[PDB]
């Protein structure tokens, strides 16, 4: 409820979006407090002194930090609602593994295209993103087992962990002039991404591409 | 068993040690395959193509990667054995949070002392480690609630996540000439570290300090 669940967030953040989608799945209402560009609020600094990052879930006045940990916490506290994590230990380990991969390696590589200077660096950064999408496509085929989502019949942990970046992916495609996730290159992910963005827990917390692209300009 | 559980490891690795301690707690026997310095084995390259890192747990011929995920997997698959993760959702989130902090921020800062050039850089790196130990000491007091371990009566997730680094901490103290974890500065952690290293799941997989210090020399 808004009385007992607060989320320190910011609408462009893919990490924050993970927390919002998961709360939606669990039918948990919450208040969302927006951070402003270029400064961290005193409330954020107080609630996440270690990292000073969003999201922060404040549940009954206790702060929980790090989006993937927050997603676990929401799944575990609100355990009677639809499950986010897979039920099987091996499946769980694999979903956790790919989410950690996305944060550690994949997402940082998106930004690397804009940062690259010169043709060899640009080609390298663009090629890397393409190679990783090929890996993620293969992984999707393996994990989904023919079902609509990474998590099976309904969105799960890995859908949320990857799908939270789709807005920034689309912006990166616009600015790089290369389409990475599409029918030709990643036909399975292409169908999945339409379904994911149409999911009622996702549809209104996923930023429209041009709006995010405008924000990307305001960014410095 | 050795037939169905293999661990790609290396005796100096704190990350690998997490997997060994957890298997020990669960009374799960396993075979350990050592990586050699300066090269990755073809078996490692095949079992962890994404990161090419140890540890890798190969359980019934399925590889699982990333030490903290491996610790979760062992806890969850071997669920009838002593529990590693806390039972409460909030406690779980907090233990996960501090383990992630240790890997992201704390452990990298240990190496920064040796890497620093000049007095201002050295002082900065040494001071940072001291500040973080003060934070970890406070966290220990809060989480342990007077019990011997972060996890309470028995070693738990966060004991394993922090304690796995004690060998490298002692080596860093030797090479930096500054003691960071001791009675004077961190009296609670000082008592805890003796108890942790004496635990039967830890005692023989924790490298003796001089041996690790010698390895640190062989390192380039």
Interface test with B, best of A4, A51, A89, A102 (most B CBs within 10 A): A89
Alpha-carbon distance of A57 to A61, in angstroms, equals 9
Question: CATH code at B28?
Answer: 3.40.30.10
Question: B16 and B45: one domain?
Answer: yes
Question: B72 and B86: one domain?
Answer: no
Give the resolution to one decimal, in Å.
1.8
Total number of domains in chain B: 2
Q: Do A69 and B100 touch (CB under 8 A)?
A: yes
C-alpha distance from B107 to closest chain A C-alpha (Å) = 15
For the packed helices A107-115 and A119-144, what is the interaxial angle rounded to 10 degrees? 160
Q: Return the closest-CA partner of residue A8 out of A36, A29, A50, A38.
A: A36
* Residue B174 exposed, middle or buried by CB count within 10 Å (0-12, 13-18, 19+): middle
Main-chain phi, psi angles of B54, to 5 degrees: -95, 155
Question: B105 and B196: one domain?
Answer: yes
Question: B30 and B73: one domain?
Answer: yes
Q: Do A93 and B101 touch (CB under 8 A)?
A: no
Question: B103 and B120: one domain?
Answer: yes
Show the tokens assigned to A7.
């989320």
Alpha-carbon distance of A189 to A186, in angstroms, equals 5
Chain B partners of A72 at a C-beta cutoff of 8 Å?
Answer: 92-93, 96
* Domain enclosing residue B74, as ranges: 1-80
Q: Is B101 on the interface with A (CB under 8 A)?
A: yes
Within chain A, how many helices (H) and strands (E) appear?
10, 4
C-alpha distance from B214 to closest chain A C-alpha (Å) = 32
Structure solved via: X-ray
Strands A56-59 and A5-9: antiparallel
> How many Å is the Cα radius of gyration of chain A?
17
Edge-to-edge order in the sheet of strand A62-65: A31-34, A5-9, A56-59, A62-65
Q: Is B66 on the interface with A (CB under 8 A)?
A: yes
- Using CA atoms, how far residue A100 sits from A194, B66, B94, in Å, is 23, 9, 18
C-alpha distance from A214 to closest chain B C-alpha (Å) = 32
Show the tokens assigned to B15.
């990350």
* Residue A160 exposed, middle or buried by CB count within 10 Å (0-12, 13-18, 19+): buried
Q: Do A89 and B96 touch (CB under 8 A)?
A: no
């Amino acid at each position: 409820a808004k009385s007992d669940v607060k989320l320190l967030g910011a609408w462009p953040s893919p990490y924050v979006m993970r927390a919002r989608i998961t709360l939606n799945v669990k039918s948990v209402d919450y208040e969302l407090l927006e951070e402003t560009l270029g400064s961290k609020s005193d409330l954020l600094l107080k609630s996440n002194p270690v990292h000073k990052k969003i999201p922060v879930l404040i549940h009954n006045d206790k702060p929980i930090c790090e989006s993937l940990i927050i997603v676990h916490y929401i799944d575990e506290f609100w355990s009677s609602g639809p499950s986010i994590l897979p039920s099987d230990p091996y499946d769980r380990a694999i979903a956790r593994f790919w989410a950690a991969y996305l944060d550690e390696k994949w997402y940082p590589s998106l930004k690397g295209i804009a940062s690259a200077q010169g043709e060899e660096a640009k080609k390298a950064a663009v090629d890397q993103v393409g190679e990783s999408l090929a890996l993620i496509e293969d992984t999707y085929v393996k994990l989904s087992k023919g079902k609509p989502f990474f998590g099976g019949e309904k969105i799960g942990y890995l859908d949320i962990a990857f799908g939270c970046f789709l807005g920034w992916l689309r912006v990166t495609e616009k600015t790089s002039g290369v389409k990475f996730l599409n029918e030709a290159k990643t036909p399975h992910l292409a169908k999945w991404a339409v379904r994911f963005c149409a999911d009622p827990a996702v549809k209104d917390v996923m930023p429209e591409t041009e709006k995010l692209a405008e924000f990307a300009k305001l960014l410095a």
